[PDB]
Amino acid sequence: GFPELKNDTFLRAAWGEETDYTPVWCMRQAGRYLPEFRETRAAQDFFSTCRSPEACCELTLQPLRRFPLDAAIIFSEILVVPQALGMEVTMVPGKGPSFPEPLREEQDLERLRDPEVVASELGYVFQAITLTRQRLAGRVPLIGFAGAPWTLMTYMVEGGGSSTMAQAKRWLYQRPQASHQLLRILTDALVPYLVGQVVAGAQALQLFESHAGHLGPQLFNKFALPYIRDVAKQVKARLREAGLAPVPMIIFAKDGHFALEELAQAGYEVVGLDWTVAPKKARECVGKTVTLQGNLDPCALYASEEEIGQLVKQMLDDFGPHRYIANLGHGLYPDMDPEHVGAFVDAVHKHSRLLRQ
Amino acid sequence: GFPELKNDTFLRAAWGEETDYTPVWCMRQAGRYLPEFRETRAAQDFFSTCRSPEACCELTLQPLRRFPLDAAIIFSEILVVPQALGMEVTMVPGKGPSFPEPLREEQDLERLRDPEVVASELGYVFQAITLTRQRLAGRVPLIGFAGAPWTLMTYMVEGGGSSTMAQAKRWLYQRPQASHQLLRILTDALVPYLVGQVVAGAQALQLFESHAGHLGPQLFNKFALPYIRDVAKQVKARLREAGLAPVPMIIFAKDGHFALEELAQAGYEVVGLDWTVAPKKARECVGKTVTLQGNLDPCALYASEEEIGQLVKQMLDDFGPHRYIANLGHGLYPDMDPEHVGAFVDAVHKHSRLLRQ
Ligand SMILES: Cc1c2[nH]c(c1CCC(=O)O)Cc1[nH]c(c(CCC(=O)O)c1C)Cc1[nH]c(c(CCC(=O)O)c1C)Cc1[nH]c(c(CCC(=O)O)c1C)C2
Ligand SMILES: Cc1c2[nH]c(c1CCC(=O)O)Cc1[nH]c(c(CCC(=O)O)c1C)Cc1[nH]c(c(CCC(=O)O)c1C)Cc1[nH]c(c(CCC(=O)O)c1C)C2
After folding, report:
1. CA atoms of B106 and B95, how far apart (whole Å)
2. Is B108 within 8 Å of A3 when comparing Cβ atoms?
3. Would you list which residues of chain B are within 8 Å, Cβ to Cβ, of chain A?
4. Cα-flanking dihedrals φ and ψ of residue A250, to 5°?
5. For residue B150, what is the enclosing H or E element?
6. Which residues of B touch A3 (CB under 8 A)?
7. Min CA distance, A137 vs chain B (Å)?
8. Which ligand is nearest to the CA of A329?
9. Minimal Cα–Cα distance from B180 to chain A, Å?
10. Min distance B211 CA to chain A CA atoms (Å)
């Protein structure tokens, strides 16, 4: 139903095969650092943008017109899942996401939709995925994505960003039962959503556990890890059952240094790394059979084009030329220079080829 | 809404009325042979230039500050239409236009936008037309333009220039149905685009069938001519319906010697000629009721100012002083001398007046 893929380097590396060079992409490659992103986004409010296949497709394509990135990622939000479960969410400029009525007690779970119906509420995402895959015309693979259960829970309880997650963690300690219930609702919504993304055309999937860092090992193993594992097991199972090829799945646990061994056993092809983990230490944690993605400090792009090249060279030396996809350790920041993102991409390609030959 | 036209000679001649002199313009009069064109163009990438009304207006005006040309043509590209249908196109300096993902099989037509929405994607062209018509302040008429369906198809399939059109012609012979489908998509996008150009201020329209020559009579009559005829019929119909004055339309089929009789019956006021067709033979083909445009070998401008004058004199003798707009037989080449373009313009004006008096 879709054009044949021309550059599959990203997929080959995700599965752990050898390639001629290291593939690269950037979290938030479609983002506010691009003037053209801001121009397209000035037309609608944020979630209206998410609900327009043409707008999502356009924002996805923009970075690919500037840089020879080895993957695209669909424009959407992780917060579409809580929204489709029935929570109201806003993204007013200057303030970040807010839920005006967060979940604060167990009884608040009653407001949520049955998780089995979330996928049908998210048809607009699938339309954006199909459109973008057709428009990409096989240039590079298209990544779909969602938030991990714990991270989604933090937003639902905290009502937005938090430096401590004190309310969400209070749920874990004081309301463990109701927490597991919410986390299971989330998992059961995520699975059919992620499956649907692949049915619509996604060629890989990333699960963002952006708030792993707040947990620590004991809480992470009890409350985050089981649902991370269940997402992967279930998504692969449903795809096989529907006659489709399962896709490479990436787990990105920001500030998750402490969980790398477990994440390596959690049924994901790729483990994404923040910039605080030394590549060689990550490699000792995860072993020889998963692919690593990352992990340059996004702020390194504030440095000169030449220094970026040298930092990239050092990073590639540490990861080595096997089982590795280059990216930053988090997303691009809004004040970053597009030319420096350009330099990061060119340096990965240049030094990875030098490192092989 | 616009200034009254001061010099309408070009329009009078297009409609076949007598004038005091022969009006002249040059394909690519805004082009790389002008140092000031290159300076304005060094600021942006090519399609960013196309999307800036001020930049398009400026490039349009430049040649008119050097030479008393009898028409302006808006700065744009024919390839904006395939781009607005959803194909990615580049114009890297030194390489010409490229589509990295050309159409290669019938199923690839699925990626394209509904042709009814192309005009709204091309609003920036209409903004450039309105701005330029206002800035011209009635000096001379402003021509809008587009590629003809077949020619646009060649780019979409071949992915760029070709000496044979072997892939595009393979479509015509092996995929006739899918070819007609593409050609109809193109026609249905072109019509509302061309209409929009006139709504925005265009005072005439040229359709460039630059790749006619590759066809020959049987394929041209089956695959190019029907859509050329449909463009004109439909554009005139929509303009009448909207309460506007239809504009003179020019069909330019480069290397189309073999189609001149049919082109004369295709509902265009003006038939443009390449330099390989002797003017008197063209006149026998098209009859007494269309206007001819052309047709000096662009390379003749490599000759001395004096020789250019003599070649122009011979050309004007052959066309005669009725139903004729002077131009070259194709566009100006980048290494041509602006003073020689100057001499071509002055010679047309001088000898056409001598030929009447
Ligand atoms: C994949 C994605 C996301 N957001 C957006 C996209 C699509 C564009 C892209 O690929 O980044 C658009 C996307 N999302 C947002 C923006 C900027 C909105 C604006 O102000 O106009 C855009 C373009 C806003 C946003 N959205 C979010 C925040 C963080 C809130 C906090 O904890 O303080 C913020 C600031 C939640 C969010 N959103 C996302 C994550 C996971 C990655 C990460 O950790 O950064 C998370 C945690 C993922
Ligand atoms: C009307 C127009 C066109 N292109 C451009 C304009 C505006 C300036 C002008 O009036 O010429 C800018 C215009 N278009 C281009 C340039 C030069 C770009 C650069 O290298 O910087 C400019 C100023 C590049 C171009 N664009 C095209 C080619 C030919 C490719 C091939 O078949 O080999 C090329 C080389 C496609 C094209 N473009 C156009 C045609 C029809 C006329 C013709 O046959 O020449 C065609 C066929 C029309």
Report:
1. 28
2. yes
3. 86-88, 100-101, 107-108, 110-111
4. -115, 130
5. helix B149-158
6. 101, 108, 111
7. 6
8. 1
9. 21
10. 25
How far away, in angstroms, is B200 Cα from ligand 2 center? 22
Task: Give the containing element (helix H, strand E) for B348.
Answer: helix B338-356
* Method of structure determination: X-ray
Encode B20-61 in three state secondary structure: CCCCECCCCCCCCCCHHHHHHHHCCCHHHHHCCHHHHHHHHH
Burial of A101 from C-beta contacts in 10 A (0-12 / 13-18 / 19+): exposed
- Quick one: tokens of B311? 């070649």
The tokens of A213 are what?
A: 């860092």
Please choose, from the candidates B8, B326, B324, B327, the residue with its C-alpha nearest in 3D space to the C-alpha of residue B139. Answer: B8
- Cβ(B239)–Cβ(B195) below 8 Å: yes
In three-state form (DSSP H/G/I as H, E/B as E, the rest C), the secondary structure along chain A is CCCCCCCCHHHHHHCCCCCCCCCECCCCCCCCCCHHHHHHHHCCCHHHHHCCHHHHHHHHHHHHHHCCCCCEECCCCCCHHHHHCCCCCEEECCCEEECCCCCCCHHHHHHCCCHHHHHHHCHHHHHHHHHHHHHHCCCCCEEEEEECHHHHHHHHHHCCCCCCCHHHHHHHHHCHHHHHHHHHHHHHHHHHHHHHHHHCCCCEEEEEECCHHHCCHHHHHHHHHHHHHHHHHHHHHHHHHCCCCCCCEEEEECCCHHHHHHHCCCCCCEEECCCCCCHHHHHHHHCCCCEEEEEECHHHHHCCHHHHHHHHHHHHHHHCCCCEEEEECCCCCCCCCHHHHHHHHHHHHHHHHHHHC
Length of chain B in terms of residues written: 357
Q: Does the C-beta of A155 come closer than 6 Å to ligand 1? A: no
Residue of chain B whose Cα is closest to the Cα of A138: B101
As for ligand 2, residues whose beta carbon falls within 6 Å of it are: B 28, 30-31, 46, 73, 75-78, 91, 93, 96-97, 145, 161, 208, 210, 254, 331
Element (H, E) at B91: strand B90-92
PDB resolution in Å: 1.9
Structural domains of chain B, ranges and CATH numbers in brackets: 1-357 (3.20.20.210)
Q: With CB atoms and an 8 Å threshold, state whether B108 touches A61.
A: no
Closest Cα in chain A to B106: A3
Distances (CA, A) of B299 to A199, B275, B293, B329: 57, 10, 17, 10
Q: Which atom of ligand 2 is nearest to the CA of B155?
A: 32
